[PDB]
Design a protein around this nucleic acid. Structure first.
Lengths: 48, 46
RNA sequence: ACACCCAGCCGCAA
């Protein structure tokens, strides 16, 4: 795609069935900076 | 440490930091309920 | 100047 030169090997091509999974990149990202604090432990709380 | 100290005759009551209580957005911690039962039975026996 | 209490259970991620 970049060079335009022929790829020396021959790539195996064809349609196939893929699926999208529940596990999202947006749902799994998480960052914390001195936010909410647990009442008992006086520590950071349990998850995003 | 002494054997008289080792057997218990006065029970230490922990502060509310040990046994926090929170209102729903006043529920008591279960340790608070248990030590309340302790002092209730102590008063009954008294 | 924030607002949401906790136990239990279950499913699930690598």
């Amino acid at each position: 795609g970049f060079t335009g030169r022929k790829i020396t090997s021959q790539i195996f091509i064809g349609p196939t069935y893929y699926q999208r999974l529940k596990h999202m990149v947006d749902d799994k990202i998480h960052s914390r900076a001195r936010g909410p604090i647990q009442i008992l432990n006086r520590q950071p709380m349990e998850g995003r | 440490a002494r054997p008289e100290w080792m057997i218990v005759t006065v029970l230490p009551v922990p502060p509310l930091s040990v046994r926090p209580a929170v209102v729903m957005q006043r529920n008591q911690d279960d340790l608070t309920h248990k030590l309340a039962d302790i002092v209730k039975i102590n008063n009954q026996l008294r």
